[PDB]
Amino acid sequence: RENLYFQGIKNVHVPDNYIIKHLIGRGSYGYVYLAYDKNTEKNVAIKKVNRMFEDLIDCKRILREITILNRLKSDYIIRLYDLIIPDDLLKFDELYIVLEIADSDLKKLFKTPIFLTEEHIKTILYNLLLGENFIHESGIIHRDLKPANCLLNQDCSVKVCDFGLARTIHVVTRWYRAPELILLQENYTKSIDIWSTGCIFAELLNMLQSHINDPTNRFPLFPGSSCFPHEKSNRDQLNIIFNIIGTPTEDDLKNINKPEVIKYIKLFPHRKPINLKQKYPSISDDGINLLESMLKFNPNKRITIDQALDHPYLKDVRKKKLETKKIILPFDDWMVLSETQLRYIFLKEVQSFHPELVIPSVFTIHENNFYNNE
Amino acid sequence: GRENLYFQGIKNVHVPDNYIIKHLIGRGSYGYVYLAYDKNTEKNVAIKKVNRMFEDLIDCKRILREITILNRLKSDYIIRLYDLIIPDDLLKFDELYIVLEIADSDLKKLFKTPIFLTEEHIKTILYNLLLGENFIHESGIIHRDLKPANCLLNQDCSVKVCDFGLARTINSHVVTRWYRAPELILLQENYTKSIDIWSTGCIFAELLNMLQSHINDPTNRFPLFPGSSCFHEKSNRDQLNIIFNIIGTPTEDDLKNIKPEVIKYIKLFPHRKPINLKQKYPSISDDGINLLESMLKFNPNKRITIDQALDHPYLKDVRKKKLETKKIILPFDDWMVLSETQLRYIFLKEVQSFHPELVIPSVFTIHENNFYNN
Numbered sequence: 233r234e235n236l237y238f239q240g241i242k243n244v245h246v247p248d249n250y251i252i253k254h255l256i257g258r259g260s261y262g263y264v265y266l267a268y269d270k271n272t273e274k275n276v277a278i279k280k281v282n283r284m285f286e287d288l289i290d291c292k293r294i295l296r297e298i299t300i301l302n303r304l305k306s307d308y309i310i311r312l313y314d315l316i317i318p319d320d321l322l323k324f325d326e327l328y329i330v331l332e333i334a335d336s337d338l339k340k341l342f343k344t345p346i347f348l349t350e351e352h353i354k355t356i357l358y359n360l361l362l363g364e365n366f367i368h369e370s371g372i373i374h375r376d377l378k379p380a381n382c383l384l385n386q387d388c389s390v391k392v393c394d395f396g397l398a399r400t401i402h403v404v405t406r407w408y409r410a411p412e413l414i415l416l417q418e419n420y421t422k423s424i425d426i427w428s429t430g431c432i433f434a435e436l437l438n439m440l441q442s443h444i445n446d447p448t449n450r451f452p453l454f455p456g457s458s459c460f461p462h463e464k465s466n467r468d469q470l471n472i473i474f475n476i477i478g479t480p481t482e483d484d485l486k487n488i489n490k491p492e493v494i495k496y497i498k499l500f501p502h503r504k505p506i507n508l509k510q511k512y513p514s515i516s517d518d519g520i521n522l523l524e525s526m527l528k529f530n531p532n533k534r535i536t537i538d539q540a541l542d543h544p545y546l547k548d549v550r551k552k553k554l555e556t557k558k559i560i561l562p563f564d565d566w567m568v569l570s571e572t573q574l575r576y577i578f579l580k581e582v583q584s585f586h587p588e589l590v591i592p593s594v595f596t597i598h599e600n601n602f603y604n605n606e
Numbered sequence: 607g608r609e610n611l612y613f614q615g616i617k618n619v620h621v622p623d624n625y626i627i628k629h630l631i632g633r634g635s636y637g638y639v640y641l642a643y644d645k646n647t648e649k650n651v652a653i654k655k656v657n658r659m660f661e662d663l664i665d666c667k668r669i670l671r672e673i674t675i676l677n678r679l680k681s682d683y684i685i686r687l688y689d690l691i692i693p694d695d696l697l698k699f700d701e702l703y704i705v706l707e708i709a710d711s712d713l714k715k716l717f718k719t720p721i722f723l724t725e726e727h728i729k730t731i732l733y734n735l736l737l738g739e740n741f742i743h744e745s746g747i748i749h750r751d752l753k754p755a756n757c758l759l760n761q762d763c764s765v766k767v768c769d770f771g772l773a774r775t776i777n778s779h780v781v782t783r784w785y786r787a788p789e790l791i792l793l794q795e796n797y798t799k800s801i802d803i804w805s806t807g808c809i810f811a812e813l814l815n816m817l818q819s820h821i822n823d824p825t826n827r828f829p830l831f832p833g834s835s836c837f838h839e840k841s842n843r844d845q846l847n848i849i850f851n852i853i854g855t856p857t858e859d860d861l862k863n864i865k866p867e868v869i870k871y872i873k874l875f876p877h878r879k880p881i882n883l884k885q886k887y888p889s890i891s892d893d894g895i896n897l898l899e900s901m902l903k904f905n906p907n908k909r910i911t912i913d914q915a916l917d918h919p920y921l922k923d924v925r926k927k928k929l930e931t932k933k934i935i936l937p938f939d940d941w942m943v944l945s946e947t948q949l950r951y952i953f954l955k956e957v958q959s960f961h962p963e964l965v966i967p968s969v970f971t972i973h974e975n976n977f978y979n980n
Contacts, residue, residue: 233726235761238711240720255720258825263720283823336613345615345630345638351608386610402825445658448633448779451837458834 234416241265244280246328248314252278257340260381260394260590261294269313276313279329285571286325292569293396297563298329298581300395303559304370308363310334310383315582321592327578331393335386338379341439345447348439348513352388354549357433358541359390360554364429365537367392368422371558373399377428378408379435396554400565406457406469407431411529414466414473415493423531426540430526437523442514471500477527478505484530518545562603573598613753616640619655621691621703627653632715635756635769636669643706644688651688652708658702661805666949668771671936673704673956675770678934679745682739684891684941685709685758685768690957696967702784702953706768710761713754716816720824723816725890727763729924732810732915734765737930739806741913743766743799746933748774752805753785754812783845784808788904791846800906803915814898819889848873853902854880860905893920937978948973 239255240263246252246307248269262281269276283292301312311332318324336344348356360382367374374395381394400508401422410427434453438444456472457465474480479502485494509521515523522545524532525535535543541550562577563569569577576595580603583589614630619640621627628641628650637656644651675783676687686707693699712720713731723731735757742749749770756769776799787804789797811830815821833848834841850856855877861869883895890898897920900910910918916925937952938944944952951970955978958964 233724233730233763236710236716236721236723236727236759236763237761238716238719239723243720258718335611341613343609344613345618346611346613348611349609352611355608385613386612388608388611455837459836460828 238540241365244278244328245264245319250276250278250330260297260396261290262329262391263520264331267330269330272313275333277331277333278330280326282326284325284327285574288569288571288574291571291574294327295563295577295581296384296398296565297394297396298399299561299563299577300372300559301331301393301509302581302584304367304372304395306363306366307389308359308366308391310391316584317582317586317589318441318579321579322594324575332391334383334391336384338382338384338435341384341565342379342435342450343447347441348436350440351549353436353439354546355388356384356390356436356498357429357535358546358549359388360392360429360432361537361540361546363390363392364425365541366556368401368425368537369556369558371401373401373422374425374428375399375413376408377425377432378405379432382432403459403461404457404465406465407452407454409469410531411470411473412531414469415497417493421531423534423536426526426534426537427531429540430523433523433526437512437515440514443512473529474500476506477529479503480529484533488530518543523546560605562606573601619653619703620694621653625651626652635672635771636665637704639706642705644705650708652706654704654706655701656704658701659700660946660949661700663944663946663949664959666946667944668951669702670938670944670952670956671773672769672771674936674938674952675747675773675934676706676768677956677959678936679742679770681738681741681931682764683734683741683766684733685759685766690960691962692957692961693954694952697969699950699953707766709758709766711759713757713812714758716759717754717812717827718824722818723813725817726740726924727919728813728816730763731759731765731813732806733921733924734763734914735767735806735809736912736921738765738767739802740916742910742930743776743802744931746776747955748776748797749802749805750790751785752802752809753782754809757809775936777837780836781834781841784829784831786845788846788849789906791842791869792848793842794868795866796863798906798911802910803909804903804906805913806915807898810898810901814887814890814894817889820887849904850875850878852881853904854878856904860908863905863907891920893918935980948976952977 241252244252246264249269251270253266253268254528255264256277259279262279264279265320267276281294284294298312298315311510313332314330316328318327318328374392376394376397381392383391383393400534406414408428408431410420410424413424418516431453438450444450453476454469454472456469458468479500480497486496488494508524512520522540522543562580572595576598579591579595583591616627619627624644626643626645628643631639631641631652634654637654639652639654642651642653656669659669673687673690676685688707689705691703691705693702720802749767751769751772756767758766758768775816785805785808787801790801808830815827821827831845831848831852833845835844855875856872883899887895896917897915903909937955947970951973954964954966954970958966
């Protein structure tokens with residue numbers, strides 16, 4: 233009987249310059265490890281994604297995740313430092329993704345036995361909003377903002393990652409999804425990211441000791457969809473949303489076109505919104521207003537990033553002074569891609585980090601169909 | 607001056623100079639647990655800080671039960687209590703530092719790790735857990751709250767049980783009900799040590815998820831009966847419902863052991879068949895499936911016993927019969943509602959067992975003759 237090696241460090245095979253230290257936790261599509269890079273004298277995060285081509289939907293999302301990160305350059309966005317050359321260029325079924333390290337992330341933060349001041353909360357929120365503004369002005373809707381992909385440093389700086397679901401302008405966690413996204417509308421805008429921000433803001437507000445003295449009593453605001461094993465999930469999620477912000481008003485339903493959608497919504501019995509000031513009593517009227525404006529059912533009624541950055545609540549932390557090109561992805565987002573095409577693009581992205589890489593000709597024959605504006 | 611965040615919370619952990627706090631391990635019962643090094647004995651230990659002790663006297667008495675039981679159990683199968691640190695304020699302490707034997711991991715953590723177990727590992731862990739439960743029961747105790755979080759684990763597959771705060775002598779918070787026997791869900795008073803066997807079946811089911819041939823992606827591992835929500839009458843209904851979804855609704859024979867009102871309640875649940883365990887776990891022999899099946903019996907009398915489980919063909923190759931006790935007496939009677947002043951007295955007497963020179967304040971010692979009688 234072999235000893236158990238709980239962190240799985242032995243499964244992590246990377247070049248000599250990287251010293252694998254320990255398991256950080258779960259990332260999107262794989263596990264993330266702390267490593268020291270001897271060549272650049274810094275700590276990095278190395279994510280191993282396995283079973284890459286088993287599910288081509290996930291595979292394309294992994295590709296989208298790395299192609300976007302490779303093209304965004306901002307202090308508000310996790311840097312992609314390296315894509316490690318696969319041992320087998322023809323048959324690789326895994327990829328090692330090397331990322332800028334952060335001290336923590338919001339998901340981890342909320343589980344820690346520490347408390348935040350209101351200054352911390354405003355600073356984190358303000359930094360998140362700055363990141364989102366950079367994302368949107370780069371022509372991207374993140375579409376899956378959640379505590380797990382808002383990385384955090386000790387100085388409250390925020391770095392966004394995990395762009396696998398992003399739009400050009402498994403049990404899934406639906407707790408941070410806008411109602412219009414839950415209602416399977418294909419007409420939605422960057423305002424879905426503002427909804428997600430409101431959800432994250434609510435959890436940041438749980439970090440005040442005067443609100444919650446016991447860290448184990450901190451919960452997401454809309455935990456409607458089950459953690460455990462599509463229609464029932466979406467229904468349950470909509471249901472908890474309405475429990476918090478009330479059923480939609482007549483003016484809310486006016487903004488929607490499809491009568492099948494309205495009819496479905498009407499099936500939900502009427503209820504009033506809960507009192508947010510009561511839920512978060514240590515927060516000023518302006519703070520409640522900001523949270524309220526982020527969590528509007530009607531996306532046109534939802535506060536914008538510009539407005540939020542201008543909001544009285546954030547006046548004290550705003551740094552107008554210390555504060556963009558639209559990105560072009562090497563594939564069109566509508567194309568369904570074959571495994572052979574996917575393999576080509578992956579290796580091209582690897583080649584951006586390793587120019588001496590010779591991509592096999594069975595893949596390079598696809599070269600004329602991609603990277604048309606690069 | 608916005609202070610840097612310090613995510614571990616090592617700052618509020620105040621212990622004598624011989625203990626060097628290294629890092630946060632995670633959540634334990636009623637408090638957070640830290641890895642520490644004891645300079646005096648030159649070994650690593652776990653230190654749990656329990657605070658807000660006397661805010662809720664129900665939790666307070668459970669904390670006391672947890673430490674008094676551990677202090678009186680002596681076994682390689684049971685986490686050792688190494689120290690109870692003297693409070694700074696003998697009169698008004700609202701926190702306690704509890705120093706425990708360190709383990710490498712625990713079953714809850716194991717199930718989240720990116721590693722896989724062989725069948726031999728699984729058999730070995732289960733066998734060791736059963737040995738621990740047998741020692742517990744022979745000591746005159748029903749654990750009553752066995753779950754992966756309190757089954758500690760070392761690399762060699764040795765298992766150490768802890769967290770006896772809900773334990774019974776054999777004569778707010780969101781509560782995890784997923785490992786509770788149906789007669790506990792149904793609030794019956796006449797239950798037996800067989801409730802621990804039900805919990806063991808639940809844990810065994812999650813151990814089986816650790817086989818790569820069952821589940822190749824660690825994120826697809828779930829408890830068997832996740833009925834009660836993560837976020838008292840509704841919870842018990844949902845938990846009982848998921849149990850019947852797995853093992854079917856109870857037969858007429860199952861009900862014979864049972865109050866007419868309770869039987870009337872169970873009948874409200876629409877009839878259903880048990881699922882097929884052989885299909886759910888296709889890599890396990892008929893022996894393993896039989897062991898699991900016989901642990902998860904609705905009727906507690908029909909459940910396999912620990913002796914029968916240790917005799918089972920499934921565990922034959924790991925059994926070390928050759929390597930296989932007094933009933934413990936608690937210093938208070940389980941039934942009595944204790945006042946804060948009485949609770950403080952017993953806490954300090956337990957502290958005194960580790961620190962004989964401690965002088966307990968006279969205002970507490972007046973309660974002497976009511977405790978430690980046996």
